[PDB]
Amino acid sequence: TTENLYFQGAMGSLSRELVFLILQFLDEEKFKETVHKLEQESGFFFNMKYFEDEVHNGNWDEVEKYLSGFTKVDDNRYSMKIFFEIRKQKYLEALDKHDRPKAVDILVKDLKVFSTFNEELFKEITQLLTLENFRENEQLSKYGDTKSARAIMLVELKKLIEANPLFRDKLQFPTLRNSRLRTLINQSLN
């Protein structure tokens, strides 16, 4: 047998190779939540299609938990900017829904961590709370709606992820034969 577990197989640990064989099995079984929890907990593969769909839907808690399997907020400048942009968007969405109690909660719990790095910016962000419409601020005058803003932010998040040394090499799923785990275990058990 000259066959590797998969085409790029001999390059990682066996645990990493088993994770990829399992990911394909879970996908073929349609165990979708298990797929993304395994991606996140192992940190071996960042599923860009899944991240896009979760951002498109504004599932911010899930977006942050998913990212947390790959990076900490303060890891590097790209990770910092990724989290900042997501939390800034959640905050702007709260203001747009005229929910000031929720916006101050996002400001205090999610955006305050950025004040250490840039004090004046956190003050400017805070000051958006008192505007009748945040679009009054020059830098946000072009903000359309929830759909348009999530799409524009996602274009930026994708570029930041692709440039981030912690993700840049976890973005391509390896090349596996069809139902590889199922085929190998079935022959090993026989």
Binding site: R77, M80, F84, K88, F117, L121, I125, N137, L140
Partner: peptide, 4 residues
């Protein structure tokens, strides 16, 4: 650094 970050921006608005």
């Amino acid at each position: 650094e970050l921006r608005l």
